Write a protein that binds this ligand. Sequence first.
Ligand SMILES: [K+]
Ligand SMILES: [K+]
Ligand SMILES: [K+]
Ligand SMILES: [K+]
Ligand SMILES: [K+]
Ligand SMILES: [K+]
Ligand SMILES: [K+]
Ligand SMILES: [K+]
Ligand SMILES: [K+]
Ligand SMILES: [K+]
Ligand SMILES: [K+]
Ligand SMILES: [K+]
Ligand SMILES: [K+]
Ligand SMILES: [K+]
Ligand SMILES: [K+]
Ligand SMILES: [K+]
Ligand SMILES: [K+]
Ligand SMILES: [K+]
Ligand SMILES: [K+]
Ligand SMILES: [K+]
Ligand SMILES: [K+]
Ligand SMILES: [K+]
Ligand SMILES: [K+]
Ligand SMILES: [K+]
Ligand SMILES: [K+]
Ligand SMILES: [K+]
Ligand SMILES: [K+]
Ligand SMILES: [K+]
Ligand SMILES: [K+]
Ligand SMILES: [K+]
Ligand SMILES: [K+]
Ligand SMILES: [K+]
Ligand SMILES: [K+]
Ligand SMILES: [K+]
Ligand SMILES: [K+]
Ligand SMILES: [K+]
Ligand SMILES: [K+]
Ligand SMILES: [K+]
Ligand SMILES: [K+]
Ligand SMILES: [K+]
Ligand SMILES: [K+]
Ligand SMILES: [K+]
Ligand SMILES: [K+]
Ligand SMILES: [K+]
Ligand SMILES: [K+]
Ligand SMILES: [K+]
Ligand SMILES: [K+]
Ligand SMILES: [K+]
Ligand SMILES: [K+]
Ligand SMILES: [K+]
Ligand SMILES: [K+]
Ligand SMILES: [K+]
Ligand SMILES: [K+]
Ligand SMILES: [K+]
Ligand SMILES: [K+]
Ligand SMILES: [K+]
Ligand SMILES: [K+]
Ligand SMILES: [K+]
Ligand SMILES: [K+]
Ligand SMILES: [K+]
Ligand SMILES: [K+]
Ligand SMILES: [K+]
Ligand SMILES: [K+]
Ligand SMILES: [K+]
Ligand SMILES: [K+]
Ligand SMILES: [K+]
Ligand SMILES: [K+]
Ligand SMILES: [K+]
Ligand SMILES: [K+]
Ligand SMILES: [K+]
Ligand SMILES: [K+]
Ligand SMILES: [K+]
Ligand SMILES: [K+]
Ligand SMILES: [K+]
Ligand SMILES: [Mg+2]
Ligand SMILES: [Mg+2]
Ligand SMILES: [Mg+2]
Ligand SMILES: [Mg+2]
Ligand SMILES: [Mg+2]
Ligand SMILES: [Mg+2]
Ligand SMILES: [Mg+2]
Ligand SMILES: [Mg+2]
Ligand SMILES: [Mg+2]
Ligand SMILES: [Mg+2]
Ligand SMILES: [Mg+2]
Ligand SMILES: [Mg+2]
Ligand SMILES: [Mg+2]
Ligand SMILES: [Mg+2]
Ligand SMILES: [Mg+2]
Ligand SMILES: [Mg+2]
Ligand SMILES: [Mg+2]
Ligand SMILES: [Mg+2]
Ligand SMILES: [Mg+2]
Ligand SMILES: [Mg+2]
Ligand SMILES: [Mg+2]
Ligand SMILES: [Mg+2]
Ligand SMILES: [Mg+2]
Ligand SMILES: [Mg+2]
Ligand SMILES: [Mg+2]
Ligand SMILES: [Mg+2]
Ligand SMILES: [Mg+2]
Ligand SMILES: [Mg+2]
Lengths: 49, 51, 56, 94
Amino acid sequence: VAMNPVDHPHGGGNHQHIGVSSCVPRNAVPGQKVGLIAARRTGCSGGKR
Amino acid sequence: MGRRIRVQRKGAGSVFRAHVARRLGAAKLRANDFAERTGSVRGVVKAILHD
Amino acid sequence: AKLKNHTSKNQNRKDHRNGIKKPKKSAYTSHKGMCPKYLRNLRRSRANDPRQSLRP
Amino acid sequence: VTYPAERRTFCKREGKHTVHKASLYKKGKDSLLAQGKRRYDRKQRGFGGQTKPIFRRKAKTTKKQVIRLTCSSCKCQTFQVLKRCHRLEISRLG
RNA sequence: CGCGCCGCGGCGAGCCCGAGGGCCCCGCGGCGGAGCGAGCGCGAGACGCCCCGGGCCCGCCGCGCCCCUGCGGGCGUGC
RNA sequence: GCCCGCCGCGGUGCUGACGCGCAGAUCGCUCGUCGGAGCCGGGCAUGGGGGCGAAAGACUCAUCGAACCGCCUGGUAGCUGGUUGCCUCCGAAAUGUCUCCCAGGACAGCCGCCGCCCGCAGUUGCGGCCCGUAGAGCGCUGGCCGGCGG
RNA sequence: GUGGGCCCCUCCUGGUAAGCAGGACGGGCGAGGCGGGACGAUCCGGACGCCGGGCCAGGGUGCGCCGCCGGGGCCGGAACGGCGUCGGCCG
RNA sequence: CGCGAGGGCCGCACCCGGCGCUGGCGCGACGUGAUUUCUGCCCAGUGCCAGACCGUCACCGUGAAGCGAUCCGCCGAAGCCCUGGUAAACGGCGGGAGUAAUGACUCUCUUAAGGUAGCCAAAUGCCUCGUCGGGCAAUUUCCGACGGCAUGAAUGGAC
RNA sequence: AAGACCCUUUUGAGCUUGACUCCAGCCCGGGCCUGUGGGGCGGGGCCGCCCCGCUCACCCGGUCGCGCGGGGACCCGCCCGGGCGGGGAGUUCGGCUGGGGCGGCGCGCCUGCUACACCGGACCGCAGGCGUCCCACGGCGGGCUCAGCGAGGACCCUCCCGCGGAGCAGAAGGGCACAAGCCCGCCCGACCCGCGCCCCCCGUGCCGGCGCGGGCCGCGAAAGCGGGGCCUACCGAUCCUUCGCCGCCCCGGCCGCGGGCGCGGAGGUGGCAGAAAAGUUACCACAGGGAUAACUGGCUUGUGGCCGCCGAGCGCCCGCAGCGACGCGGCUUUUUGAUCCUUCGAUGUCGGCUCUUCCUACCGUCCGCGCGCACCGGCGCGGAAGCGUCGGAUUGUUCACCCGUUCAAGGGAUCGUGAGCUGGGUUUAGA
RNA sequence: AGCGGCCGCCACCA
Ligand SMILES: [K+]
Ligand SMILES: [K+]
Ligand SMILES: [K+]
Ligand SMILES: [K+]
Ligand SMILES: [K+]
Ligand SMILES: [K+]
Ligand SMILES: [K+]
Ligand SMILES: [K+]
Ligand SMILES: [K+]
Ligand SMILES: [K+]
Ligand SMILES: [K+]
Ligand SMILES: [K+]
Ligand SMILES: [K+]
Ligand SMILES: [K+]
Ligand SMILES: [K+]
Ligand SMILES: [K+]
Ligand SMILES: [K+]
Ligand SMILES: [K+]
Ligand SMILES: [K+]
Ligand SMILES: [K+]
Ligand SMILES: [K+]
Ligand SMILES: [K+]
Ligand SMILES: [K+]
Ligand SMILES: [K+]
Ligand SMILES: [K+]
Ligand SMILES: [K+]
Ligand SMILES: [K+]
Ligand SMILES: [K+]
Ligand SMILES: [K+]
Ligand SMILES: [K+]
Ligand SMILES: [K+]
Ligand SMILES: [K+]
Ligand SMILES: [K+]
Ligand SMILES: [K+]
Ligand SMILES: [K+]
Ligand SMILES: [K+]
Ligand SMILES: [K+]
Ligand SMILES: [K+]
Ligand SMILES: [K+]
Ligand SMILES: [K+]
Ligand SMILES: [K+]
Ligand SMILES: [K+]
Ligand SMILES: [K+]
Ligand SMILES: [K+]
Ligand SMILES: [K+]
Ligand SMILES: [K+]
Ligand SMILES: [K+]
Ligand SMILES: [K+]
Ligand SMILES: [K+]
Ligand SMILES: [K+]
Ligand SMILES: [K+]
Ligand SMILES: [K+]
Ligand SMILES: [K+]
Ligand SMILES: [K+]
Ligand SMILES: [K+]
Ligand SMILES: [K+]
Ligand SMILES: [K+]
Ligand SMILES: [K+]
Ligand SMILES: [K+]
Ligand SMILES: [K+]
Ligand SMILES: [K+]
Ligand SMILES: [K+]
Ligand SMILES: [K+]
Ligand SMILES: [K+]
Ligand SMILES: [K+]
Ligand SMILES: [K+]
Ligand SMILES: [K+]
Ligand SMILES: [K+]
Ligand SMILES: [K+]
Ligand SMILES: [K+]
Ligand SMILES: [K+]
Ligand SMILES: [K+]
Ligand SMILES: [K+]
Ligand SMILES: [K+]
Ligand SMILES: [Mg+2]
Ligand SMILES: [Mg+2]
Ligand SMILES: [Mg+2]
Ligand SMILES: [Mg+2]
Ligand SMILES: [Mg+2]
Ligand SMILES: [Mg+2]
Ligand SMILES: [Mg+2]
Ligand SMILES: [Mg+2]
Ligand SMILES: [Mg+2]
Ligand SMILES: [Mg+2]
Ligand SMILES: [Mg+2]
Ligand SMILES: [Mg+2]
Ligand SMILES: [Mg+2]
Ligand SMILES: [Mg+2]
Ligand SMILES: [Mg+2]
Ligand SMILES: [Mg+2]
Ligand SMILES: [Mg+2]
Ligand SMILES: [Mg+2]
Ligand SMILES: [Mg+2]
Ligand SMILES: [Mg+2]
Ligand SMILES: [Mg+2]
Ligand SMILES: [Mg+2]
Ligand SMILES: [Mg+2]
Ligand SMILES: [Mg+2]
Ligand SMILES: [Mg+2]
Ligand SMILES: [Mg+2]
Ligand SMILES: [Mg+2]
Ligand SMILES: [Mg+2]
């Protein structure tokens, strides 16, 4: 997010922000597969095992 | 519509290759052979070193 | 951005400059649009008139 | 909107007025061996995408329905085009 | 280089230094001569200094009537 | 990856000098840092829609929101500039219709030239038909002050 | 070739209006020399080969600056004020 | 957040390569940004994921017809559809009327949920030089308070 | 320095994405590569699936081939098929317009008015309408007369007069009475084949209408009338597709399928004489444009500002000391608009500081008059531009607001003044 | 326009 849009798909904007969801699918192509790749779930919650 | 991103540039190598100078070598078990495969073989620890 | 839309300022003079023409002398007698039954009868009468006919 | 089930009008095959039965005309399905379709398929082979225009900017909310009139005595077909309208039905009396 | 129109030269129901072969000699096409019809195909005389119009003839589309070799021939009517 | 401070490395303010310069980025005073993610030299590696980037679209030999060199290439322009002697005879348009048309065109008009052929008029008078404007008016469609008599 | 026009006189439309914008018959500048309107593309006359003489349109005739005398009177801009001066109408 | 090597992410025209002389205290992809004290509600939308084969959805294959070209049926992988999970994924987090000068109370329309703890005319407040206190002879600046055109919780909140 | 702002050009480029049209890559299925055996399930009367041994193809390890393994007919590779796919590629992103944009749609048609009595005549002029609706709401014949007013009749009926004051689908204008309206009867001219004219107009097309020659019909005793619904609006090329008549061709022949062709309708282009099409640029552009905005100047003066006329009232009385409502007439260019004449191969664009000169619509001082002028102090008018109109707190501020003093008018000069300065504001590139 | 039951999924030269 600190870059320009030419350098990265998170780049640009008048505020630093990603813009879309950062969960990307498993079959995304090289150049697209940034952020969280094929996440079953996200966030920080307790109670796993 | 862009340039190649940082993760795309690391695969070619160049400045992204491992710094292997002054490494002691690859760490491995002893190769299985006749004598170990049928009995036991003896070694002595000569040094303990930082890699 | 905007230009003029319309005038007829010089047009009557342009219309007059070569004179006002008249249509040809034979358009007053064109058969076009007359009754075909009348035109048929005309052709028959002249065709059978020995003083008017042009049959060989 | 309402059209008679049956009508008496001219027939060419016999050359006189007879009784005809009404029905609705509908465009049949496209053949694969018509010459323009053959030309289109051959032009669309290969790389390069769409080779002909695709019409988008659509205005009319109505087509002109046409009535098939089938002659009773001899089975000669005739067609009548109607003015544009939104609903149409033929009467049911044979 | 191609297309249209105009002028002039030669010859004229004809015209023509293709290429080629022996500033001279010989030299095919082609275009013009008949059109119309999608096509099967059929196929022009009757008049006129010139021009314009009228009339009639040929083809395409239609329709009376007669016949021989026949969905073929003849003769007519109409836009 | 402590503090003052020299060389070094950097480059804050004077919005100082200079700004036809000493100089296609320099000079003076002031200023940041100075044992560390510190500074310097040589060799080597990464090549153009590619590299490299503690990220400014920065840097890649005074060239970078895509280097430089030769060719394709005398690239296309309804757009701006220019377009070289004399006399004589004629002489416009800036309008209608259509156009991804509105700084451009095609057809028509207006003009030139070349012709060819054998009554007429941008006028008055006389005769016949047509028009609904100025004025006038409140019958028609609408609007509007009041006074009598039942 | 042209398909950006503009102005005047009369007649209009929108606008508080405009040297504003949009239309109409006729004329002009454009593409019209010369004189006059001090000065101006379009107003008033007159529209053009090179000269000599004459007549004169429009405007004018104290000096600059070509050209005059005689006669009869008087002595940018609104509503609204004036016993300034000269002339009238009604009582 | 992904991955136990027959793997994962990346290079690369092809052959062949980097991480890797590596092995989960590792490697790779992302966001926030020392400490202290905290980090509320929403899975309706978009995104991601796994569990079942309902509908749809290729070629191949196969049946019936046909002189044949071919026409019509059947069959049915992944995907979508369906069933669930997930916000330190992207993001979102309220109106009218009364009621002891206010409004603890109430009735009502309504959302996926209706902004919690905090903070503020703030480098975020239009109105606006907001109102009150401090300071000055005098202050559109400044500080302290009060409460939102359009404050607010790893878009990290407060200190 | 051929404006970098702004606009136009059928001139670009960087970036984005739910623009349009695609490509690598990856996922998935069958087939070939590809052996040698054993089994289960189902269907149709041989076919389709599924499973699991072995090793010999093919593939992976260890070893200096020093006394060894693991997978396996599956994987890979190749052919064809389907899905994901701004990671990447190419291209597009209407027009008119008192600048552009937001808005609107005189962009294809219709009525009345503008429009100045033949025809024609402009505007993002005025008041409006159209993309439909009806086998009857149509054709013909016959009969009838509508809206109503007045007068009558137990708690709809009758007469009389009745120029249309009703009705005729929907805007407006026009038209119509033994009808063009209403009711009844029968019908389908809301048909077929072939021509011409009118409107618009370049005398091209398209919508719409009108006049004919020949078939076949409807109603009517008959003369007649009829190609919809009284008239003026209600709609669509080439190429392609589809359907219907009668035929012709498939070029070495013949036959059957199939294909093509001549005529006519339908599927549609409303941006309506008819491309297949989304954004952003504060990183930037190119050719041009004063044909066109942002700043001076010019015309105008609504708005701002200033000055007159009248005289309902106020002023204890008393219209005019001082005031002055309802109205009416002017001036100025120090406000802001309106417009687009000059300037886009460039006229440095806010304020302050510094310095000079000008105006008078005069605030203090000077000379006169007036008062609801006793004095003091105020107020009103005429002449008058010589001198004076200041120091500070907050704000870039012009402005404003307060404190203080000898108590403190208003303006102009390219909104005076950047090769005089300054650079706080506005006004590129970072955040 | 195509299958299935207002809905899904699929398709597109005047
Ligand atoms: K972003
Ligand atoms: K891009
Ligand atoms: K790229
Ligand atoms: K790239
Ligand atoms: K890329
Ligand atoms: K790169
Ligand atoms: K065809
Ligand atoms: K293609
Ligand atoms: K010759
Ligand atoms: K023919
Ligand atoms: K130093
Ligand atoms: K600096
Ligand atoms: K100095
Ligand atoms: K220096
Ligand atoms: K130190
Ligand atoms: K590299
Ligand atoms: K390199
Ligand atoms: K490049
Ligand atoms: K290059
Ligand atoms: K070169
Ligand atoms: K080359
Ligand atoms: K080039
Ligand atoms: K061009
Ligand atoms: K150009
Ligand atoms: K030039
Ligand atoms: K058009
Ligand atoms: K265009
Ligand atoms: K034009
Ligand atoms: K143009
Ligand atoms: K031309
Ligand atoms: K009246
Ligand atoms: K106005
Ligand atoms: K002239
Ligand atoms: K002239
Ligand atoms: K007088
Ligand atoms: K996050
Ligand atoms: K971190
Ligand atoms: K603590
Ligand atoms: K914290
Ligand atoms: K949700
Ligand atoms: K859910
Ligand atoms: K969800
Ligand atoms: K709160
Ligand atoms: K504060
Ligand atoms: K928020
Ligand atoms: K220029
Ligand atoms: K420019
Ligand atoms: K420019
Ligand atoms: K502009
Ligand atoms: K520009
Ligand atoms: K251009
Ligand atoms: K362009
Ligand atoms: K660019
Ligand atoms: K672009
Ligand atoms: K660029
Ligand atoms: K893509
Ligand atoms: K583009
Ligand atoms: K014409
Ligand atoms: K019409
Ligand atoms: K007829
Ligand atoms: K067509
Ligand atoms: K075409
Ligand atoms: K057809
Ligand atoms: K230029
Ligand atoms: K221009
Ligand atoms: K110009
Ligand atoms: K001009
Ligand atoms: K004025
Ligand atoms: K201008
Ligand atoms: K101007
Ligand atoms: K300029
Ligand atoms: K200047
Ligand atoms: K100049
Ligand atoms: K004075
Ligand atoms: Mg940045
Ligand atoms: Mg991108
Ligand atoms: Mg003429
Ligand atoms: Mg029949
Ligand atoms: Mg230190
Ligand atoms: Mg230090
Ligand atoms: Mg050239
Ligand atoms: Mg060039
Ligand atoms: Mg002449
Ligand atoms: Mg013009
Ligand atoms: Mg078009
Ligand atoms: Mg003008
Ligand atoms: Mg003069
Ligand atoms: Mg003299
Ligand atoms: Mg951060
Ligand atoms: Mg925030
Ligand atoms: Mg330039
Ligand atoms: Mg254009
Ligand atoms: Mg471009
Ligand atoms: Mg435009
Ligand atoms: Mg009619
Ligand atoms: Mg900036
Ligand atoms: Mg101008
Ligand atoms: Mg005024
Ligand atoms: Mg202009
Ligand atoms: Mg200059
Ligand atoms: Mg200057
Ligand atoms: Mg300067």
